[PDB]
Design a protein around this ligand. Structure first.
Ligand SMILES: O=C(O)C[C@@H](Cc1ccccc1)C(=O)SCC(=O)c1ccccc1
Ligand SMILES: O=C(O)C[C@@H](Cc1ccccc1)C(=O)SCC(=O)c1ccccc1
Ligand SMILES: [Zn+2]
Ligand SMILES: [Zn+2]
Lengths: 153, 148
């Protein structure tokens, strides 16, 4: 397991729209090793999520791994995630970011999101996230779209 | 071996300063799989070089693989020395398809770089490989050959 360097706020890599993962990357040692190194980076910093741009990889891969301080959730790796629907109900919750290590704040998020994504093997999954996990999905997708949580306060 | 999608001219990824590879990443499966995907992408495109930014990886990793030579992967390459002697050669670019142009390059360059294992090494290139080294370093610094 490798801990990768993390991009900080002010770095341009964090403001791009990340490129989708191609079909021939699915089920590849390349994609497993990218996700493993992202997972290790997230755990090193006690994060609950991570997005490939934060480790200088402009690709649509995220990890969501909730814990209470809310489910205790083992990391789920999402390739090419797409939020199909944001709920009408909207709640404010505390967020931090590995790319903004000095600040936390309250961000308004959809209470639930319907998310479609590919596993590392390339299986299509659709799941509805609620609560803290929903906030983490919305945060990580914002990283893929060049958006930091401080821009949403 | 994976062929990676290649960013084209006008994508902002090609305009950044790529980040140095960390000590953590040297001699890792991660870094070997990155060099292998980059190598495969270069071969499938009939390239003679490639830089990580071209496959949406903002890291300082290049491959030089010309005459004939065995492919060299360079981590955190730096040009330490170059000839006043300039030459002009035709260049193209995996990221600027169906564009060809004459570019002035140093005829000789000495490059310090790390191996995939993390050993500090120096090498001198002449002629076509020297042109390729300079083109790949330009990609790490957000420069496309069309600007030269
Ligand atoms: O994607 C990141 O940048 C990591 C991040 C994700 C996140 C945390 C909280 C809400 C949305 C997204 C973190 O893991 S930051 C530190 C953290 O673990 C945490 C922050 C606030 C509350 C609880 C935990
Ligand atoms: O964009 C790249 O880095 C790939 C590139 C490298 C390069 C070629 C020539 C001079 C400097 C750098 C290419 O391989 S371009 C397309 C190509 O296949 C080619 C170009 C010239 C000679 C032989 C092949
Ligand atoms: Zn974040
Ligand atoms: Zn090029």
């Amino acid at each position: 397991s490798v801990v990768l360097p993390v991009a900080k706020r002010g770095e341009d890599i964090l403001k791009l729209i990340a490129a989708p993962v191609s079909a021939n990357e699915l089920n590849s040692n390349w994609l497993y090793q990218l996700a493993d190194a992202m997972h290790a980076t997230m755990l090193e910093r006690n994060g609950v999520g991570i997005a490939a741009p934060q480790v200088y990889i402009s690709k649509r891969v995220i990890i969501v791994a909730s814990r209470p301080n809310a489910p205790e959730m083992n990391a789920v790796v999402m390739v090419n995630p797409e939020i199909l629907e944001f709920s009408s109900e909207t709640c404010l919750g505390e967020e931090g970011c590995l790319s903004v290590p000095d600040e936390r704040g309250q961000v308004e998020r959809a209470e639930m999101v319907k998310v479609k994504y590919l596993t590392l093997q390339g299986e299509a999954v659709e799941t509805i996230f609620h609560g803290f996990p929903a906030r983490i999905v919305q945060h990580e997708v914002d990283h893929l779209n060049g958006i930091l949580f401080v821009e949403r306060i």
